[PDB]
Amino acid sequence: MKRTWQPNRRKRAKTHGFRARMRTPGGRKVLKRRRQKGRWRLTPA
Amino acid sequence: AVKKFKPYTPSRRFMTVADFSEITKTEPEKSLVKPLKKTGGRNNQGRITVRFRGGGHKRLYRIIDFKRWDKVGIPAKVAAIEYDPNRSARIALLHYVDGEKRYIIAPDGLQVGQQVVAGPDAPIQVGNALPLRFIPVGTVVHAVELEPKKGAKLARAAGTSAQIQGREGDYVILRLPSGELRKVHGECYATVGAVGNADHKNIVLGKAGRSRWLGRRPHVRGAAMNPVDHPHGGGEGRAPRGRPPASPWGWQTKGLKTRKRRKPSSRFIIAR
RNA sequence: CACCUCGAUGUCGGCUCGUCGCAUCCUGGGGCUGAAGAAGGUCCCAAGGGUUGGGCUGUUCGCCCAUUAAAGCGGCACGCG
RNA sequence: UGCGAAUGCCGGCAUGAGUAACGAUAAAGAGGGUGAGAAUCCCUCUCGCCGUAAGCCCAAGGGUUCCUACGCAAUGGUCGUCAGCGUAGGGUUAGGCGGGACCUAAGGUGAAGCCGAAAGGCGUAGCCGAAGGGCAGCCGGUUAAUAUUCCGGCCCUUCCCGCAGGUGCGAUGGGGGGACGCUCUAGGCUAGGGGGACCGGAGCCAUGGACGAGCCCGGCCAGAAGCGCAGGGUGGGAGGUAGGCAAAUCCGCCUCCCAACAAGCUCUGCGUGGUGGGGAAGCCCGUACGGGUGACAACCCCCCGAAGCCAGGGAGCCAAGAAAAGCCUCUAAGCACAACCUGCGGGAACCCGUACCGCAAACCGACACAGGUGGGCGGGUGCAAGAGCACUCAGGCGCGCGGGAGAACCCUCGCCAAGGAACUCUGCAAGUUGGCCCCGUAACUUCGGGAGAAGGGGUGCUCCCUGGGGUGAUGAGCCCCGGGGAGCCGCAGUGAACAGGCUCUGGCGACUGUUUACCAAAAACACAGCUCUCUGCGAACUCGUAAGAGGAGGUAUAGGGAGCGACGCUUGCCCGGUGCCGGAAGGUCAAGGGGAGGGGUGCAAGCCCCGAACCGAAGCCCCGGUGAACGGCGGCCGUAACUAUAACGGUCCUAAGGUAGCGAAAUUCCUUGUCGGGUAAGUUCCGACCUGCACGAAAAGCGUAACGACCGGAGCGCUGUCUCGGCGAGGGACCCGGUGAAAUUGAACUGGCCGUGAAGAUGCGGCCUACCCGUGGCAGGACGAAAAGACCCCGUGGAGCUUUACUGC
RNA sequence: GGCGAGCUAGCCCUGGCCAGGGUGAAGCUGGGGUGAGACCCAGUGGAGGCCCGAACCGGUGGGGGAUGCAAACCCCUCGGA
RNA sequence: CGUGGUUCGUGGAGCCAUGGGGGAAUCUGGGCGGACCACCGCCUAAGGCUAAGUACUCCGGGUGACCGAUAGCGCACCAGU
RNA sequence: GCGGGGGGAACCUGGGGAACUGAAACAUCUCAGUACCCAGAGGAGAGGAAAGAGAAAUCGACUCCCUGAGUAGCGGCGAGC
RNA sequence: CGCGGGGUGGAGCAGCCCGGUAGCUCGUCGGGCUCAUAACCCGAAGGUCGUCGGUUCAAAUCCGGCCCCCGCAACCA
RNA sequence: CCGAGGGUAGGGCCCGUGACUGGGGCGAAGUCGUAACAAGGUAGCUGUACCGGAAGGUGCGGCUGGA
RNA sequence: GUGGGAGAGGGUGGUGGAAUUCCCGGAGUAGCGGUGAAAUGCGCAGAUACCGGGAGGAACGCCGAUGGCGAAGGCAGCCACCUGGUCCACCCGUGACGCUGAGGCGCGAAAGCGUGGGGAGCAAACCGGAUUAGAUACCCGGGUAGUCCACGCCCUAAACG
Ligand SMILES: [Mg+2]
Ligand SMILES: [Mg+2]
Ligand SMILES: [Mg+2]
Ligand SMILES: [Mg+2]
Ligand SMILES: [Mg+2]
Ligand SMILES: [Mg+2]
Ligand SMILES: [Mg+2]
Ligand SMILES: [Mg+2]
Ligand SMILES: [Mg+2]
Ligand SMILES: [Mg+2]
Ligand SMILES: [Mg+2]
Ligand SMILES: [Mg+2]
Ligand SMILES: [Mg+2]
Ligand SMILES: [Mg+2]
Ligand SMILES: [Mg+2]
Ligand SMILES: [Mg+2]
Ligand SMILES: [Mg+2]
Ligand SMILES: [Mg+2]
Ligand SMILES: [Mg+2]
Ligand SMILES: [Mg+2]
Ligand SMILES: [Mg+2]
Ligand SMILES: [Mg+2]
Ligand SMILES: [Mg+2]
Ligand SMILES: [Mg+2]
Ligand SMILES: [Mg+2]
Ligand SMILES: [Mg+2]
Ligand SMILES: [Mg+2]
Ligand SMILES: [Mg+2]
Ligand SMILES: [Mg+2]
Ligand SMILES: [Mg+2]
Ligand SMILES: [Mg+2]
Ligand SMILES: [Mg+2]
Ligand SMILES: [Mg+2]
Ligand SMILES: [Mg+2]
Ligand SMILES: [Mg+2]
Ligand SMILES: [Mg+2]
Ligand SMILES: [Mg+2]
Ligand SMILES: [Mg+2]
Ligand SMILES: [Mg+2]
Ligand SMILES: [Mg+2]
Ligand SMILES: [Mg+2]
Ligand SMILES: [Mg+2]
Ligand SMILES: [Mg+2]
Ligand SMILES: [Mg+2]
Ligand SMILES: [Mg+2]
Ligand SMILES: [Mg+2]
Ligand SMILES: [Mg+2]
Ligand SMILES: [Mg+2]
Ligand SMILES: [Mg+2]
Ligand SMILES: [Mg+2]
Ligand SMILES: [Mg+2]
Ligand SMILES: [Mg+2]
Ligand SMILES: [Mg+2]
Ligand SMILES: [Mg+2]
Ligand SMILES: [Mg+2]
Ligand SMILES: [Mg+2]
Ligand SMILES: [Mg+2]
Ligand SMILES: [Mg+2]
Ligand SMILES: [Mg+2]
Ligand SMILES: [Mg+2]
Ligand SMILES: [Mg+2]
Ligand SMILES: [Mg+2]
Ligand SMILES: [Mg+2]
Ligand SMILES: [Mg+2]
Ligand SMILES: [Mg+2]
Ligand SMILES: [Mg+2]
Ligand SMILES: [Mg+2]
Ligand SMILES: [Mg+2]
Ligand SMILES: [Mg+2]
Ligand SMILES: [Mg+2]
Ligand SMILES: [Mg+2]
Ligand SMILES: [Mg+2]
Ligand SMILES: [Mg+2]
Ligand SMILES: [Mg+2]
Ligand SMILES: [Mg+2]
Ligand SMILES: [Mg+2]
Ligand SMILES: [Mg+2]
Ligand SMILES: [Mg+2]
Ligand SMILES: [Mg+2]
Ligand SMILES: [Mg+2]
Ligand SMILES: [Mg+2]
Ligand SMILES: [Mg+2]
Ligand SMILES: [Mg+2]
Ligand SMILES: [Mg+2]
Ligand SMILES: [Mg+2]
Ligand SMILES: [Mg+2]
Ligand SMILES: [Mg+2]
Ligand SMILES: [Mg+2]
Ligand SMILES: [Mg+2]
Ligand SMILES: [Mg+2]
Ligand SMILES: [Mg+2]
Ligand SMILES: [Mg+2]
Ligand SMILES: [Mg+2]
Ligand SMILES: [Mg+2]
Ligand SMILES: [Mg+2]
Ligand SMILES: [Mg+2]
Ligand SMILES: [Mg+2]
Ligand SMILES: [Mg+2]
Ligand SMILES: [Mg+2]
Ligand SMILES: [Mg+2]
Ligand SMILES: [Mg+2]
Ligand SMILES: [Mg+2]
Ligand SMILES: [Mg+2]
Ligand SMILES: [Mg+2]
Ligand SMILES: [Mg+2]
Ligand SMILES: [Mg+2]
Ligand SMILES: [Mg+2]
Ligand SMILES: [Mg+2]
Ligand SMILES: [Mg+2]
Ligand SMILES: [Mg+2]
Ligand SMILES: [Mg+2]
Ligand SMILES: [Mg+2]
Ligand SMILES: [Mg+2]
Ligand SMILES: [Mg+2]
Ligand SMILES: [Mg+2]
Ligand SMILES: [Mg+2]
Ligand SMILES: [Mg+2]
Ligand SMILES: [Mg+2]
Ligand SMILES: [Mg+2]
Ligand SMILES: [Mg+2]
Ligand SMILES: [Mg+2]
Ligand SMILES: [Mg+2]
Ligand SMILES: [Mg+2]
Ligand SMILES: [Mg+2]
Ligand SMILES: [Mg+2]
Ligand SMILES: [Mg+2]
Ligand SMILES: [Mg+2]
Ligand SMILES: [Mg+2]
Ligand SMILES: [Mg+2]
Ligand SMILES: [Mg+2]
Ligand SMILES: [Mg+2]
Ligand SMILES: [Mg+2]
Ligand SMILES: [Mg+2]
Ligand SMILES: [Mg+2]
Ligand SMILES: [Mg+2]
Ligand SMILES: [Mg+2]
Ligand SMILES: [Mg+2]
Ligand SMILES: [Mg+2]
Ligand SMILES: [Mg+2]
Ligand SMILES: [Mg+2]
Ligand SMILES: [Mg+2]
Ligand SMILES: [Mg+2]
Ligand SMILES: [Mg+2]
Ligand SMILES: [Mg+2]
Ligand SMILES: [Mg+2]
Ligand SMILES: [Mg+2]
Ligand SMILES: [Mg+2]
Ligand SMILES: [Mg+2]
Ligand SMILES: [Mg+2]
Ligand SMILES: [Mg+2]
Ligand SMILES: [Mg+2]
Ligand SMILES: [Mg+2]
Ligand SMILES: [Mg+2]
Ligand SMILES: [Mg+2]
Ligand SMILES: [Mg+2]
Ligand SMILES: [Mg+2]
Ligand SMILES: [Mg+2]
Ligand SMILES: [Mg+2]
Ligand SMILES: [Mg+2]
Ligand SMILES: [Mg+2]
Ligand SMILES: [Mg+2]
Ligand SMILES: [Mg+2]
Ligand SMILES: [Mg+2]
Ligand SMILES: [Mg+2]
Ligand SMILES: [Mg+2]
């Protein structure tokens, strides 16, 4: 029955995408955090 | 006016439809049409600021002429009387001798083929816009400006009108459709006649869905909520108000006068 | 009353399945009778077996219909999820 | 720094146990092949399942899963020689398909501008943004694997340049157009389908008959111009002109003059068209798959016929139905040795996608998960129709454990003597009914309904006669709708499959609708409709610190808040309290104003500090209004010429003392009230009475046709619900082979009784009973498991909610 | 202080979908009627939060499932269409 | 007047700062020594800059009555995987 | 023409700024100008050359350590600071 | 049982707080007016304060018990 | 074939009876009031409408069968 | 037919003055109102009486009558438009074309009803003050439907001469 995850590639880059993150000060700190931790991926692929 | 229906369904027994025999325009509208951004009652934050709106037919906005003082002296033939979805009233199409077209909100009695004109000139006749100062005391009028040059504001709803009761200095006294008595400036335009399509107020919506066509979504009683939601929310069965009757935001809704006290406009008001 | 159980002993009634007690409803045996007979009354012995089908109510119970030898009363975590 | 406990933490390994289970009951059998090994891989045959799909095509999403070679550790619920698995190699070809060097939508973003402590919010134009608009490719062949992409044939588009001819050319500016709903729908086509005695074709005559006007198979596809047929769009000329934010010769508007029509002009569909291409059954060939032949294949008539096309078609209706570019026209600066237009010719034509899965073993669901997933195609026969049901085509599948046995018991299913609701909270469940045609059809009603009311009859096949349509010649054929007559067979003719049981009578809700995703679908919410109230427009109101925005590009016939909730008849009295409304007076009142009068200090001038009267808002007080505002709407005692009762009276209280209607009720405690009805019997139900614990008029009163998967009561019909069970089917359970979990678990060498014990003992006492160990079974006990009781209390634990609790904002 | 409306709720923009039957509103036409009308009767017409019912959307009752095929499923039945 | 800073929570409440109102002077001017007045002192506001002594540890080095693969960093191993 | 923009472990200044908690309840008070968010700076940052201190005719910028001192005070004169 | 209010001439009510002399309306009785009754007018009588104790000088009054009465309560279970 | 009738289902009319309920007629001396007849002590009546223990009262209009 | 009359006869649209009420302005003070007599009510928050302005609805004084018109119900300021009946004179035309009238159809005071509107004065119901034994009445103060208009119903009457 209809579950929670319904992938669509546009939505994803539109939402967790790199340019998305950089617009909001909130999101820039996500990048700042993810970088500082050494995340191999700052952002979903 | 007022089409009725044999009860071949429930709600067809009570439904009542407007009379369109005044209308000459069939469907189409003159491309003085422009598109309407439907709000859903939502403001520029995505936030509902007016409840229970949305749904309902797509509509094209017919742009309509609420200043008649551009075309001063230039007359016009009344070309068509048309249906406008954005208002209770009907619009009349005007072909100016200028070659220009405008929509006027259509007065009661105004015929297709009449000549109309607007200005300090002009007969006192149905359709004719004049400064208020030149309209003879007692004539009933619609589409009035409140301040000069700012556009018609008062008596635009189907069937409404206003009456000129008197002059005092640069102002005249009008009786508004509310029955309030107001000084308006003499310089303000007005256009003689009542608005008409006055049978409008007797339409019987008749079924739920017909409210849904006009973009009115179901309206829910505070009485039917819980207290998180509304001052009436709560308490076992039914239950009375338990307090002086309130809005959802908690102010009192029987009698509490809400007009701001110190409004400058108060110097120019006299009534209910 | 507050003693085991609140780091859980599922609670009425029904149904199914019973088993026990006897202060015995019936059947068997008795004494007394204000026991003519038949039919009762009361009390004693007796737990082997039996102890109906419906209407009403969630009901237990009760009331009622129609029968019956009789339409027993209790206990078993108000027996038994 | 020493562990045995913390439902401790991490790991390991046990128990349960060779137990449950191995994931849809569509289903399998055999022969051959391969290999170390075969139920499970390959190939043949036979059998079964899907077929508005379980077949095919597209979009998401996935991302090599694709094709092939070698391979079986693991993954695969068994096996595996196979694979969606390991290794390796190969494989996706575009000016026309999709997207981008085009447009705009919501929204986003944003030169200007506005706001905000910072971060940042907003915002005109512009810009971004498509499954909308615009735009040029069709048929066939080819690969192991791609093809509108390669190839073959036939067509087309835009840029660049040149030639020729035309013309005031020229735009991001002006104008036209693009450009629009819902329902119904005409004519003509097309896709698609059926039939053919006609045309083409390998073969076939079995088992009793048939060499036949037999059986079987096939009878098309694409195509520029031109041409036909059907449709779409559209007036032509002049004069005036002040409007379309400059200017226009354009468009608009007034006048005149011809057309009224597709006549013309133009555009599209379809047909035909030079050419090109396909082309069955069957037999043969070794593939895992295809290839040869059939073949010089035929290539044609009739009929059905779209929801598709012609398309901006038509009609009706109200709820009144995007935008911008492409496109055409008009002019502007400008340039008019430019430029643009038309034709022809040569050249130029970029980026990304393209494998494969795609109702699923490749997507979302930890799984090769019985769930979920948008668009298109979806054949034939029959049944009234159909995308329904059954069976079938093409195509695809038998669901990745099997073999046996034939217990209990479970599930899904079939039948049943007599009875027929006696079952039970309740006919729950299951039966009955069931499609179409005809007869027929009540109370009541808002006149529509109620209605499929109810209850009935028909229903197949054969021959005969005969009516109307469609297409065709008015004709035959083909197709559609029938009408009458005589017969035939069976238990039965909607012969299988899909396919209402019905009636009476209450409650609640008018109605269709909505809801607690995952225990409530309802009497709850909503609803049209009624009332009150607010709001004069920079409206009230809401969101935001603000700017801004919604309201609304609306204007009192409008907008907001509130209650009530179709409709009918109605909706009484109380304004003392609270709320709101009104009230220029008076009372009280903050800061401030005002300073009588006092004080500190200094030699003083002075500096400094208190400070009464008085003048001072809103608010409250006070006066009054207000009931579809919050709300409220009596008590005791007497009294009629039998009795009872009390129309009547007395008296106390109140702001006023409950009107109509209704009433043991979704409300009545006593209560199974009393009486009546229905029953053999009725705590329910219907009717009535009134002693209403504790009904009562917009938290509406009392009714109401129709409606309801609501809740009550009764009858008929019919039943395995029951008396009361029986038999049968299949899937499990049992047995054998394969693979093989789980909660739980102080350790166990773990009996009954009567006692005892922290009061319910396998474990203590006394007696009794009892050889060791299993398997299928039942659930009485281990105060069985699960979940650190959800109830209850306790904690100066928490949190949601309220208000005339406190304190703030 | 951030992350979430790829689930779910509402709205906005833009597309798509709803086999097949049934009932027969207004209107129109004709006829009757009248002084003229209202009206009546036919035929036509094709309305509706109209009827039956697939797709689609649901989730009524019962059964099964309950270490499930499934952390909401399957069968029968049923509502809207 | 309203507030903040200080040990100072309105207190006898000054000092430093400043949102609001009124609003000066230039040495004989002004601020301060804890309400205010006198006296006696201290200091010169409404412009700006200024090493060092100080904080820290991504980084390199040296040491340890620091750990020794359940420890020590989450990571001794291709781990922010 | 020159510059700015962004990053940096912690450390620094500035703009803003909590609650649990403590008070064995709780409002002032505490936690705390902490956490945190924002701007900015640098290898440090801040501060700095008296309109100071504050009782001595005293001392002389600023920062940092020790001490003064849990003193003076502050305080529902409570907790505590 | 629980809690609050009560009990006073024939009726219905004050008085009880706050000790000392029981009031009001109606009713009853005697008279008047009327032909008569009712209305009306002038006079009058009538209660030991539910009951039993106690307190005080003095108790309807303040306290206790018992007795009837009205109201509220009886929840989680 | 038709057919007496029997059956099954649904209508219509009539009669009888029914808890209860509506009024009505009647009945030597009940209770409450006094509406009408004499300006009947508010002229009367009247259609209607609201109200009220009851007669009735009141509104609007009408009549004289009143002044 | 022709020519002439009188008329509150009907429908529609306009229009005038008096008065009542409310509001605004003025002046002005201690009561006004009301009755059998009062009381409620109103009034020093400035009432009543007086004047000026304004708003709004209803009804039309004198003329007016013992009058006129209409089938009846009914019809009354003035103006215009449309329109019914009626009578007189002339003696012109048709040639009995007549009467009445069950059914039908239409009209039909007031009150009442529906949907809108309008609402000054009046006033069922209702409240209050007096009266009374009571007073759900009579008198007084308030007062909502209604009275008014449009459309559509109801169809009654001491609709009587
Ligand atoms: Mg997940
Ligand atoms: Mg996408
Ligand atoms: Mg999306
Ligand atoms: Mg990397
Ligand atoms: Mg936003
Ligand atoms: Mg819609
Ligand atoms: Mg509502
Ligand atoms: Mg609720
Ligand atoms: Mg919320
Ligand atoms: Mg609230
Ligand atoms: Mg409430
Ligand atoms: Mg509840
Ligand atoms: Mg309640
Ligand atoms: Mg409630
Ligand atoms: Mg108002
Ligand atoms: Mg205990
Ligand atoms: Mg317990
Ligand atoms: Mg347990
Ligand atoms: Mg015995
Ligand atoms: Mg005997
Ligand atoms: Mg026995
Ligand atoms: Mg029962
Ligand atoms: Mg009982
Ligand atoms: Mg017990
Ligand atoms: Mg028990
Ligand atoms: Mg159970
Ligand atoms: Mg084991
Ligand atoms: Mg076992
Ligand atoms: Mg087993
Ligand atoms: Mg098994
Ligand atoms: Mg399987
Ligand atoms: Mg299986
Ligand atoms: Mg098929
Ligand atoms: Mg993809
Ligand atoms: Mg995957
Ligand atoms: Mg791979
Ligand atoms: Mg493969
Ligand atoms: Mg393997
Ligand atoms: Mg395996
Ligand atoms: Mg592979
Ligand atoms: Mg190409
Ligand atoms: Mg763009
Ligand atoms: Mg923005
Ligand atoms: Mg696009
Ligand atoms: Mg497109
Ligand atoms: Mg293209
Ligand atoms: Mg191809
Ligand atoms: Mg030129
Ligand atoms: Mg074809
Ligand atoms: Mg043969
Ligand atoms: Mg054929
Ligand atoms: Mg071939
Ligand atoms: Mg069209
Ligand atoms: Mg553009
Ligand atoms: Mg491809
Ligand atoms: Mg699909
Ligand atoms: Mg697959
Ligand atoms: Mg599988
Ligand atoms: Mg699946
Ligand atoms: Mg999967
Ligand atoms: Mg779905
Ligand atoms: Mg689907
Ligand atoms: Mg069929
Ligand atoms: Mg099917
Ligand atoms: Mg049977
Ligand atoms: Mg039977
Ligand atoms: Mg059933
Ligand atoms: Mg009936
Ligand atoms: Mg039938
Ligand atoms: Mg046959
Ligand atoms: Mg023909
Ligand atoms: Mg069937
Ligand atoms: Mg059916
Ligand atoms: Mg009931
Ligand atoms: Mg309902
Ligand atoms: Mg109702
Ligand atoms: Mg329905
Ligand atoms: Mg919803
Ligand atoms: Mg609900
Ligand atoms: Mg639910
Ligand atoms: Mg829930
Ligand atoms: Mg439902
Ligand atoms: Mg449910
Ligand atoms: Mg209503
Ligand atoms: Mg605000
Ligand atoms: Mg705005
Ligand atoms: Mg707007
Ligand atoms: Mg309601
Ligand atoms: Mg009321
Ligand atoms: Mg009353
Ligand atoms: Mg009140
Ligand atoms: Mg009051
Ligand atoms: Mg009040
Ligand atoms: Mg004052
Ligand atoms: Mg002062
Ligand atoms: Mg004041
Ligand atoms: Mg008052
Ligand atoms: Mg009551
Ligand atoms: Mg009762
Ligand atoms: Mg009863
Ligand atoms: Mg009750
Ligand atoms: Mg009862
Ligand atoms: Mg009974
Ligand atoms: Mg009853
Ligand atoms: Mg109410
Ligand atoms: Mg009712
Ligand atoms: Mg329902
Ligand atoms: Mg429904
Ligand atoms: Mg059975
Ligand atoms: Mg079997
Ligand atoms: Mg024991
Ligand atoms: Mg032992
Ligand atoms: Mg021992
Ligand atoms: Mg057991
Ligand atoms: Mg516990
Ligand atoms: Mg607490
Ligand atoms: Mg969404
Ligand atoms: Mg479809
Ligand atoms: Mg239809
Ligand atoms: Mg429907
Ligand atoms: Mg249906
Ligand atoms: Mg279900
Ligand atoms: Mg303090
Ligand atoms: Mg000082
Ligand atoms: Mg200073
Ligand atoms: Mg100093
Ligand atoms: Mg100093
Ligand atoms: Mg200086
Ligand atoms: Mg520095
Ligand atoms: Mg280091
Ligand atoms: Mg290790
Ligand atoms: Mg480690
Ligand atoms: Mg080791
Ligand atoms: Mg680790
Ligand atoms: Mg800071
Ligand atoms: Mg705190
Ligand atoms: Mg604390
Ligand atoms: Mg504490
Ligand atoms: Mg606490
Ligand atoms: Mg602090
Ligand atoms: Mg820097
Ligand atoms: Mg430095
Ligand atoms: Mg500095
Ligand atoms: Mg501190
Ligand atoms: Mg007397
Ligand atoms: Mg004494
Ligand atoms: Mg409770
Ligand atoms: Mg016969
Ligand atoms: Mg017969
Ligand atoms: Mg009288
Ligand atoms: Mg009298
Ligand atoms: Mg009298
Ligand atoms: Mg009288
Ligand atoms: Mg009455
Ligand atoms: Mg009265
Ligand atoms: Mg009369
Ligand atoms: Mg006249
Ligand atoms: Mg003659
Ligand atoms: Mg009438
Ligand atoms: Mg009338
Ligand atoms: Mg009025
Ligand atoms: Mg009175
Ligand atoms: Mg009185
Ligand atoms: Mg009056
Ligand atoms: Mg009559």
Residue numbers in the entry:
A (entry chain P8): 1 to 45
B (entry chain 11): 2 to 273
Sentences from the paper on this structure:
Here we present several high-resolution structures of Thermus thermophilus 70S ribosomes programmed by templates carrying missense errors. The collection of our structures puts forward a decoding mechanism that, for the first time, sets the molecular basis behind the phenomenon of translational infidelity and is in good agreement with in vivo studies of the missense errors that occur during protein synthesis. Our models suggest an advanced mechanism of decoding that, for the first time, describes how a missense error can skip discrimination, leading to translational infidelity. Our data provide evidence that steric complementarity and shape acceptance but not the number of hydrogen bonds between the decoding centre and a codon–anticodon duplex play the discriminatory role during decoding.
For this study, we chose a ‘challenging' pyrimidine–purine mismatch, C·A, and a purine–purine mismatch, A·A, and we solved seven high-resolution structures where these mispairs were placed at either of the first two positions of a codon–anticodon duplex in the aminoacyl-tRNA-binding site (A-site). Thus, the C·A mismatch at the first codon–anticodon position was shifted from the Watson–Crick geometry; however, the shift did not quite reach the wobble position, possibly reflecting a metastable or average state. A close-up analysis at every mismatch revealed that despite the stabilization of the sugar-phosphate backbones by A-minor groove interactions with the A1492/1493 and G530 of the 16S rRNA, the nitrogen bases of the A·A and C·A mispairs did not interact stably. Independently of which near-cognate tRNA was present in the centre, the conserved A1493 and A1492/G530 of the 16S rRNA stabilized the first and second codon–anticodon pairs in a manner identical to that of the cognate models.
